[PDB]
Design a binder for this molecule. Structure first.
Ligand code: SF4
Lengths: 427, 117, 180, 353, 95, 166, 160
């Protein structure tokens, strides 16, 4: 009964924007997201399904993360176009529907419904924004066509469009591949990774925050329902992580480097799919969402258009707490103790080893060790000598959000046996 | 329902209509003076420029067509409820009413924003 | 869209060319272009007798001509001092207002037809036909009538003119009230 | 076609060819009658010439139509130039066989109709959309952007009101429950004259047909006196003839459909004659429509868009939802009669303020 | 079964279009062709597996209409002031 | 095929073209008002076949030059003649158009036959509406091969059929 | 069957080849409309009757109508401007188009299915209870998707 809250707020605001100032609309959107988050929590351990809409721990956790990302990215959006808020609402609802069903066709409708408002939110009208939106839309519709033929061949291998069917030989494998194409594209897995750097570089920074958190979250929420074979999973992980880290080595701009890093991180998250633990992946994505939203909130405080790596430098002297949280985020994404990224990474690797894929895991670990080069070149750059750089030291809004993100990251890294007990049915 | 023979009869209808249309066009084309001239083949309005060199046409017609495709999808969804109505009862009526209200919210949004633009 | 509304097309009465600077459905600005009817009354009148020019005066405004006839006659009278009989002045105002009725009929007919309905053109124009016949009684011509003179009017009215005028004057009030 | 037989394919082809040449003769003589009726409206009288009743003047017109140098204009698409009139005519002729001109077997043995598809209104809807297709395509192919803009106005308006046609047609489907015209006509046989139940939607159907070039937008446009129209202005001998032919067939198709759907398709309570009542109702609607042609002004396509989009279509869907509640709950069939009579009294009393 | 093979071939043709085309709109057309091939496969497997693929293809039509509307808005916004719709004309974002 | 090459077919199509005369006015001056008056409810050229009035030149066979033809308009009107379907006819209405009339000056074409091939001339100022009907009936019998000059010669059905346009 | 079935399939594939091959955008869209007509006939042949009629109404009648409206507002018919041709990608592209079918052909090869079901015609009479009901949730999701799509396009053009 959370989706009803989302729908009510969205539909009412669609008209209320004519009588309410965009700021009042922003307050309304924020209230709706907080109410939906609270309704999700009060239903913790209360799975609820009416039709093909089915809420389990996965729906609960991933929609909680998506709602967090939406709240954070709405805090920064201050444009006087109430539409620039409405779309955000949609995506949340859309992503909710993505994690809340097993029906492949409702999965497609949910994907389109959460993705379309992103295409429009990416228009600050900066000439790069147009190029980004065009690549995004074209490649996304291509992936949607592939995913739809996959759902069709699924219906061919089984009488229902719901996942879990027994499955045939070549036809079921082929349908699985045609679904995996779109799902990995949405999750920014290579060799479907091309769109992510360009789109993250072109889009306004807070929108990139929202994307790199909630879109990847919901994409893996949908992947968890699929029974992806180990060969496909291994190929995706290998190619994704390798290209992610390597192409990130060559990056000169923070947002493009972070997009390649997120490709590598989707490659890592693709390990928990070996078992579909939904506990390992839930934990990993919790930590990743917090850290990446933090990093992109800081980057938005720097510049929405584009931020080079040098702009990050001197940040500690500029703002100490900000530099500290940025260091925490770089290390947590590096998955280093005593930070929660280590626990998420370990849980994914434990799922992988339990599935019995060893060489893939070793290659992932080597690529993660290579990643430390730029992870430190970003985290440690905070202390460097400040060069010429625009700096907007946020409102107390973004400061408090960043502080809470870093605090939750370290708290759950130090004592993970606090929430990890309740990632199953929810005791 | 209806037998499939009616659809082959429909194909025959199309065949006769198309045949007669092509026959009429042949009558028109073959019976004529056929003295082509340079200015005769020129589009219109005395040398050049009926409209001439103009910027791309208003997007208003794009919006007209997009509105139309969306609302025709609406109607295509409303018809299956129109045929089976008494059987779907208040449940189907309520579902169709909520659906209609969603797309009517879309209409009211585009109207209070308007497209004179 | 610098649109070239050509002369006479699309159906732009009174041959005239228009350059409609136009974006969308509005009208940014219309640049008119005229001269397609330049005949040269002001030049040809320099080479025609005063009496002959009364044949050139109605042809400029061919709808309300008797105002041109009157203007030219009055100007030449004031120039050489002619004495207008009173009945000539009465008849001149009669013919002036009558040709004004015919001009106004044509203006509103063309306007309604140009955009709107085609029907109301006929009825008004029908009454115009009636008016035209009156001139044929006295001038022998529909319009371009050479009836005015320097002193007054050319010759006296027939017996049959006035009763037809009364017929039309009694049918007209209901008619104009119907258009209104 | 649950209870109705199927004629042989050769008989279907025979009836089709007959319907098409009859539509030809009908639109020629209806051009005559419209000329004379508009004439009578404006007290001038029509062509008492080449006839006497004029009934040999369309022959002279057709004789002009061919031999008139069917011209291929330069700067025009070689193929679409010739193809678009064919599209407009093909997709205009058909969708008229479905109209029942009598009870089964009343074609002197086989079938009053040509095809009686299970889904009729959808076929009508699709072939009505393809007419707008031909309109704006010919506008484009002409190579004249002046005429292109008129083609765009035409297409926009026709498309908007063509959308409204769906919500107009929704209401009676609830009552009859079938998408074949014969079931609907038989329902008007039993309960009687569906417009009594659904007069408001009938209205938004009627006015919708005005937007399909019938009249009073009248900024369709025709090339005359406004931003010139599309789909003509570059075709001379036979293609122009095909454009006018298809437009008039569409006019008469609407004039025939309006009584078939809401009012009494022939099926009279009295004298139950197959063809004569339907043709006479066609004549009534045609005369009222020519009255409109003569008697009313233009709309300028902006107020036309406003009236169609903001007024007609929401009203049609409101009535559809009302009828849907009533039918699914099936409480009486009387409630719709009462509500339509009351609504007509409302939309009537507001006139003479 | 020839229907399903033809749907696969139409998907392949749409792939060839998306890859070969230079214009954005023609790529979008090839994608629509891919969608219709998918719909044909769905109708065949509904004939096989009990009629659900028909409602499936209906919802697919509606999804297609949504994405067509939004994508054409995009195509408008990006190439309104700009020159030729050629998709290679925008190479600002490089690796 | 030009309405020719069969003894019956050419008389038939001459009948058809004659009663199917579609007048396309090119309203220039006070002649044009007396042509518009030939459409009202006293004297309508709406019987012989001339009811419909297509402003487009691609659609009409009779071109009626009704008014003075000033030189600045001479090519424009000219092109409307070139942009007409080939079975086309041209009438010169009034004195200013037929000859230079009384405006025998620098501005006015002294015979519209200069720019367009004229079929029939109709004097008058303005030519009475019934006279314009007379000229269209004259043209009717001219395209029937029923028209002779003062010198005994029969006049061909279509003027503008004998000219090397350029 | 096979008599006209071969015809329909040959026309379908030929139209696809046109829509992907022709450089006339208008002619490509027209070949896709012809494809849609052939495909609606195929749909009806497959006992889906309502779906073929909507395929003509919405897809051909509405979608590619807006496509044509866009390419007529923005001429774009001669697409080959601003080339960057990458000529060698033209054969290579087809290669991938081959594979994307072949593996599908492999997954569908040697695949025989029970094509025996009395659909009773794909009429909406039976689809009503299926749509409003088992699909009502997917229906309402679709409706919200379209409403949001309208809002997205409005805010996307929105010159201000
Ligand atoms: S001939 Fe007489 S009526 Fe005709 S344009 Fe000349 S002045 Fe006017």
């Amino acid at each position: 009964m959370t989706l009803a809250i989302l729908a009510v707020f969205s539909v009412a605001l669609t008209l209320l924007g004519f009588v309410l100032p965009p700021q009042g609309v922003k307050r309304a959107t924020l209230l709706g997201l907080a109410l939906a988050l609270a309704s999700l929590l009060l239903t913790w351990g209360k799975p609820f399904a009416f039709g093909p809409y089915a809420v389990d721990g996965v729906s609960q956790v991933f929609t909680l993360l998506a709602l967090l990302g939406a709240l954070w990215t709405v805090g920064l959006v201050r444009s006087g176009r109430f539409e620039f808020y409405l779309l955000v609402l949609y995506a949340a609802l859309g992503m909710h529907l993505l994690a809340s069903t097993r029906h492949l066709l409702l999965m497609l409708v949910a994907l389109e419904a959460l993705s379309l408002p992103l295409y429009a939110l990416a228009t600050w009208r900066r000439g790069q924004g147009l190029e980004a939106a065009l690549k995004y839309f074209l490649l996304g519709a291509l992936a949607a066509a592939f995913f739809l033929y996959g759902a069709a061949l699924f219906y061919g291998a089984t009488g229902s469009l719901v996942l879990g069917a027994p499955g045939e030989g070549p036809l079921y494998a082929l349908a699985l591949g045609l679904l995996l194409v779109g799902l990995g594209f949405k999750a920014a897995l290579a060799p479907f990774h091309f769109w992510t750097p360009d789109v993250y570089q072109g889009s306004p920074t807070p929108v990139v925050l929202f994307m790199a958190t909630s879109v990847k979250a919901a994409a893996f929420a949908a992947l968890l329902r699929v029974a992806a074979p180990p060969e496909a999973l291994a190929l995706l992980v290998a190619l994704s992580v390798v290209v992610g880290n390597l192409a990130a080595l060559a990056q000169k701009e923070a947002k493009r480097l972070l997009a390649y890093s997120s490709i590598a991180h989707a490659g890592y998250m693709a390990l928990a799919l070996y078992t579909g633990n939904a506990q390992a992946l839930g934990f990993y994505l919790l930590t990743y969402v917090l850290a990446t939203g933090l990093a992109f909130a800081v980057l938005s405080q720097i510049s929405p258009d584009r931020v080079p790596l040098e702009a990050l430098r001197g940040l500690y002297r500029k703002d100490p707490l900000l530099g500290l949280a940025f260091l925490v985020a770089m290390l947590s994404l590096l998955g280093l103790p005593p930070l929660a990224g280590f626990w998420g990474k370990y849980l994914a690797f434990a799922e992988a080893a339990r599935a019995g894929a060893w060489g893939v895991l070793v290659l992932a670990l080597v690529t993660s060790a290579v990643s430390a080069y730029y992870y430190l070149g970003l985290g440690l750059a905070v202390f460097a000598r400040p060069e010429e750089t625009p700096f907007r030291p946020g409102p107390p809004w973004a400061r408090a959000a960043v502080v809470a993100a870093g605090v939750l990251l370290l708290a759950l890294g130090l004592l993970p046996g606090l929430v990890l007990p309740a990632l199953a049915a929810g005791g | 329902m209806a037998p499939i023979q009616e659809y082959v009869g429909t194909l025959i209808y199309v065949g006769v209509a198309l045949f007669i249309g092509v026959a009429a066009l042949l009558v028109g084309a073959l019976l004529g003076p056929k003295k082509p001239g340079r200015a005769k083949l020129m589009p219109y309005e005395s040398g050049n420029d009926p409209a001439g060199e103009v910027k791309r046409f208003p997007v208003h017609f794009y919006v007209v067509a997009m509105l139309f495709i969306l609302f025709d999808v609406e109607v295509a969804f409303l018809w299956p409820y129109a045929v089976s109505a008494g059987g779907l009862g208040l449940y189907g009526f309520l579902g169709v009413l909520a659906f209609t209200l969603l797309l009517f919210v879309g209409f009211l949004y585009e109207w209070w924003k308007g497209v004179m633009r | 869209m610098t649109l070239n509304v050509g002369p006479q097309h699309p159906s732009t009465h009174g041959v005239l060319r228009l350059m409609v600077t136009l974006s969308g459905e509005e009208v940014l600005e219309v640049v008119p272009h005229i001269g397609y009817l330049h005949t040269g009354f002001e030049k040809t009148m320099e080479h025609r007798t005063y009496l002959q020019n009364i044949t050139y005066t109605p042809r400029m405004d061919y709808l309300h001509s008797f105002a041109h006839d009157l203007a030219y006659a009055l100007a030449v009278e004031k120039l050489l001092g002619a004495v207008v009989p009173p009945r000539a002045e009465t008849i001149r105002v009669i013919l002036n207002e009558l040709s004004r009725l015919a001009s106004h009929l044509v203006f509103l007919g063309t306007g309604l037809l140009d955009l709107g309905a085609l029907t109301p053109f006929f009825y008004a124009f029908r009454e115009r036909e009636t008016i035209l016949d009156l001139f044929e009684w006295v001038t022998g011509q529909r319009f371009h009538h050479n009836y005015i003179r320097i002193g007054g009017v050319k010759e006296d009215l027939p017996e049959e003119f006035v009763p037809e005028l009364k017929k039309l004057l009694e049918v007209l009030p209901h008619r104009i009230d119907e258009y209104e | 076609t649950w209870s109705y037989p199927v004629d042989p394919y050769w008989m279907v082809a025979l009836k089709a060819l007959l319907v098409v040449v009859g539509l030809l003769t009908a639109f020629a003589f209806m051009t005559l009658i419209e000329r004379r009726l508009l004439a009578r409206f404006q007290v001038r009288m029509g062509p008492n010439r080449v006839g006497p009743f004029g009934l040999l003047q369309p022959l002279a017109d057709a004789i002009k139509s061919i031999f008139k140098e069917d011209i291929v204009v330069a700067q025009a698409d070689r193929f679409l130039f010739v193809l678009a009139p064919l599209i407009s005519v093909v997709f205009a002729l058909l969708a008229f066989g479905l109209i029942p001109f009598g009870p089964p077997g009343s074609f002197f043995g086989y079938q009053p109709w040509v095809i009686n598809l299970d889904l009729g209104i959808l076929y009508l809807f699709a072939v009505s959309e393809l007419a707008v297709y031909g309109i704006f395509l010919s506008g484009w192919a002409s190579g004249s952007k002046y005429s292109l803009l008129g083609s765009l106005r035409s297409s926009a308006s026709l498309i908007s009101y063509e959308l409204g046609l769906g919500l107009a047609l929704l209401a009676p489907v609830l009552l009859v429950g079938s998408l074949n015209l014969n079931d609907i006509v038989n329902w008007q046989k039993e309960h009687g004259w569906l417009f009594l139940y659904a007069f408001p939607a009938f209205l938004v159907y009627l006015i919708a047909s005005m937007a399909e070039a019938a009249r009073t937008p009248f900024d369709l446009p025709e090339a005359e006196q406004e931003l010139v129209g599309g789909y003509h202005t570059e075709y001379s001998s036979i293609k122009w003839a095909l454009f006018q032919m298809a437009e008039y067939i569409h006019f008469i198709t609407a004039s025939a459909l309006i009584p078939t759907l809401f009012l009494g398709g022939w099926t009279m309570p009295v004298l139950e004659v197959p063809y004569l009542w339907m043709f006479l109702k066609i004549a009534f609607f045609l005369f009222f429509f020519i009255w409109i042609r003569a008697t009313w002004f233009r709309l300028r396509y902006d107020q036309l868009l406003r009236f169609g989009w903001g007024f007609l279509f929401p009203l049609a869907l409101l009535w559809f939802l009302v009828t849907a509640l009533v039918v699914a709950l099936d409480l009486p069939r009387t409630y719709l009669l009462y509500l339509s009579a009351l609504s007509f009294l409302v939309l009537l009393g507001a006139v003479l303020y | 079964m020839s229907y399903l093979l033809t749907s696969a071939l139409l998907f392949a043709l749409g792939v060839y279009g998306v890859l070969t085309r230079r214009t954005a709109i023609l790529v979008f057309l090839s994608i629509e062709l891919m969608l219709n091939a998918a719909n044909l496969s769905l109708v065949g497997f509904a004939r096989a597996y009990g009629l659900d693929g028909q409602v499936a293809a209906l919802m697919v039509i509606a999804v297609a209409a949504a994405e067509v509307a939004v994508g054409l808005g995009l195509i408008v916004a990006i190439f309104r002031h700009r020159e030729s719709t050629a998709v290679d004309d925008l190479s600002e974002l490089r690796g | 095929r030009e309405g020719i090459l069969f003894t019956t077919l050419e008389k038939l199509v001459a009948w058809g073209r004659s009663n199917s005369l579609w007048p396309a006015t090119f309203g220039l001056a006070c002649c044009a008002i007396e042509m518009m008056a030939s459409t009202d409810a006293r004297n309508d050229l709406a019987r012989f076949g001339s009811e419909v009035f297509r402003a487009s030149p691609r659609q009409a066979d009779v071109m009626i030059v009704a008014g003075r033809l000033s030189k600045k308009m001479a090519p424009v009107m000219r092109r409307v003649w070139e942009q007409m379907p080939d079975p086309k006819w041209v009438i010169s209405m009034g004195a200013c158009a037929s000859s230079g009339g009384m405006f025998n000056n620098y501005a006015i074409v002294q015979n519209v036959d200069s720019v367009v091939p004229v079929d029939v001339y109709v004097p008058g100022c303005p030519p009475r509406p019934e006279a314009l009907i007379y000229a269209v009936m004259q043209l009717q019998k001219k395209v029937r091969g029923q028209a002779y000059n003062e010198r005994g010669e029969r006049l061909p059905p279509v003027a503008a059929w004998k000219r090397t346009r350029g | 069957m096979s008599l006209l079935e071969g015809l329909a399939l040959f026309l379908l594939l030929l139209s696809g080849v046109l829509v992907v091959t022709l450089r006339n955008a208008i002619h490509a869209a027209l070949a896709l409309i012809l494809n849609f007509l052939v495909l609606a006939g195929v749909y009806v042949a497959l006992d889906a009757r309502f779906l073929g009629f909507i395929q003509v109404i919405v897809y051909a009648g509405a979608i590619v109508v807006l496509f044509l409206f866009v390419i007529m507002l923005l001429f774009a018919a001669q697409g080959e401007i601003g080339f960057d041709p990458l000529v060698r990608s033209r054969p290579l592209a087809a290669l991938l188009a081959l594979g994307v079918a072949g593996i599908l052909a492999a997954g569908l090869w040697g695949l025989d299915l029970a094509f025996t079901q009395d659909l009773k015609g794909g009429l909406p009479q039976a689809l009503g209870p299926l749509l409003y009901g088992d699909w009502l949730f997917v229906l309402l999701a679709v409706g919200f998707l379209l409403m949001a799509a309208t809002v997205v396009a409005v805010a996307l053009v929105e010159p201000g």
